[PDB]
């Protein structure tokens, strides 16, 4: 018997391609709903740290497209974790895998309905691991999600994480920062 997950999750991959449109580089890799199928995927796909500059992975609840425009994300936001260029060889894959296990294993308590999915952006200037939630104004819920994320990933206080609306005249401040 495979161990069933609370819901179905889809893995997406975007390969950087200066030729074509952003939305056309986005491919859904697989959908899974058991722990065993999660691992069969994870074990055979390339490590985040191995990706070429401009590539991303997304892990989103089935039926949520990993875009700002999707109805599930339109009023939402993200906890953002920047990974120092210098420390990425030791933190990038660890951060990403811990976040995936925390989400599929439903580790966000009574707040799991607010989680849309996770994103890793692999970049030259520095990688980013993010957790997308469906409502940017649910401050209590968002703060709590952030505290658990920080804990799961063992992010120290010297490295703030921030919650921001999905990105006119003014640079938008983050809604929440930890440590505050």
């Amino acid at each position: 018997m495979r161990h069933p997950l609370q819901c179905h999750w889809a893995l997406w991959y975007l390969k950087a391609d200066r030729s074509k449109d952003w939305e056309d580089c986005l491919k859904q890799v697989a959908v899974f709903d058991t722990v065993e199928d999660f691992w069969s995927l994870y074990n055979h796909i390339q490590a985040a740290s191995g990706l070429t500059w401009g590539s991303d992975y997304y892990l989103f609840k089935e039926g949520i497209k990993p875009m700002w425009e999707d109805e599930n994300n339109v009023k939402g936001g993200r906890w953002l974790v920047v990974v120092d260029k210098q420390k990425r060889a030791q933190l990038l894959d660890h951060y990403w895998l811990e976040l995936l296990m925390a989400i599929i294993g439903e580790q966000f308590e009574d707040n799991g309905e607010y989680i849309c999915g996770a994103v890793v952006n692999v970049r030259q200037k520095g990688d980013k691991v993010s957790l997308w939630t469906r409502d940017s104004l649910k401050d209590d819920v968002n703060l709590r999600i952030g505290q658990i994320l920080k804990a799961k990933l063992e992010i120290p206080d010297t490295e703030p994480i921030r919650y921001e609306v999905h990105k006119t005249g003014s640079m938008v401040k983050p809604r929440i920062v930890i440590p505050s």
């Binding site: 997950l5 609370q6 722990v35 296990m101």
Partner: peptide, 13 residues
């Protein structure tokens, strides 16, 4: 709810 902690997810791998 179905909940798996990291230790458990590991032993399945």
């Amino acid at each position: 709810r179905i909940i798996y902690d990291r230790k458990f997810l590991m032993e399945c791998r």
